């Protein structure tokens, strides 16, 4: 019982994802190369990767139905607070549970816990990050549910600094109703409710992952020798 508006929304989000996610990872060749050999040897490569993904998340967010009906300040607030979470979400497409790594094409662009360690982060973040990727992968989401979850995570009225929270909620409500209805067409109860509840829990997990990444990013970026290796976009989005 997907309405034609709900079918329209899913078609829009699927296309937006296909225009902002490159499964070939061809643009990785333009990043500063990874050094693995202590110095934060993977910070330059991973900073470029994160910077590249921030751009993709902005491109995806712009195509969410209703997002551009918000003020520019609310668009900025929603993107600044959600960029880290959407990166963790969209990274799950490359995550594989064979060796707990993000496989993006080749061994050069295959990242494990030690590579994240090589960017300055500790297990306080990486251990919660890995169990998130595993639990998300075990859901075996359809691409429809995946792109809906990313959009819902962006248009969240539960963000500090939001001005028109009621408008943000109304936009999220139709994405949420679209996701709930899509699940019901593919899963009878109670499995239908067990899936949507686990997806909302993943959004809750991202909030604590958001908090821990910002704590470690603040300690890392406070050192000028580290922030020198970042990009201007990362400094703007992750800093102010």
């Amino acid at each position: 019982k997907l309405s034609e508006e709900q079918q329209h929304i899913i078609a829009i989000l699927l296309d937006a994802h296909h225009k902002t996610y490159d499964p070939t990872y061809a643009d990785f060749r333009d990043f500063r190369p990874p050094v693995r050999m202590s110095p934060l040897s993977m910070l330059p490569h991973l900073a470029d990767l994160v910077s590249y993904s921030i751009q993709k998340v902005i491109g995806f967010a712009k195509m969410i139905p209703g997002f551009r009906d918000l003020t520019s300040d609310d668009q900025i607030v929603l993107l600044k607070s959600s960029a880290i979470e959407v990166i963790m979400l969209r990274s799950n497409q490359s995550f594989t549970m064979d060796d707990m790594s993000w496989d993006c094409g080749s061994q050069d662009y295959k990242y494990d816990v030690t590579d994240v360690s090589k960017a300055g982060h500790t297990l306080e973040l990486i251990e919660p990050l890995i169990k998130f990727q595993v639990g998300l992968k075990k859901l075996n989401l359809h691409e429809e549910e995946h792109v809906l979850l990313m959009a819902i995570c962006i248009v969240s009225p539960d963000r500090p600094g939001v001005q028109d929270a009621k408008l943000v909620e109304a936009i999220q409500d139709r994405l949420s109703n679209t996701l709930q209805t899509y699940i019901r067409c593919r899963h009878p109860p109670p499995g239908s409710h067990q899936l949507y509840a686990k997806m909302i829990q993943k959004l809750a997990d991202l909030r604590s992952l958001n908090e821990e990444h910002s704590k470690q990013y603040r300690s890392l970026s406070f050192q000028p020798e580290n922030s020198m290796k970042l990009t201007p976009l990362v400094l703007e989005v992750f800093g102010n």
Binding site: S72, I76, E236, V237
Partner: peptide, 11 residues
């Protein structure tokens, strides 16, 4: 507290 790069990408 100003985001000229995000604004440019949002435009």
């Amino acid at each position: 507290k100003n985001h000229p790069m995000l604004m440019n990408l949002l435009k």
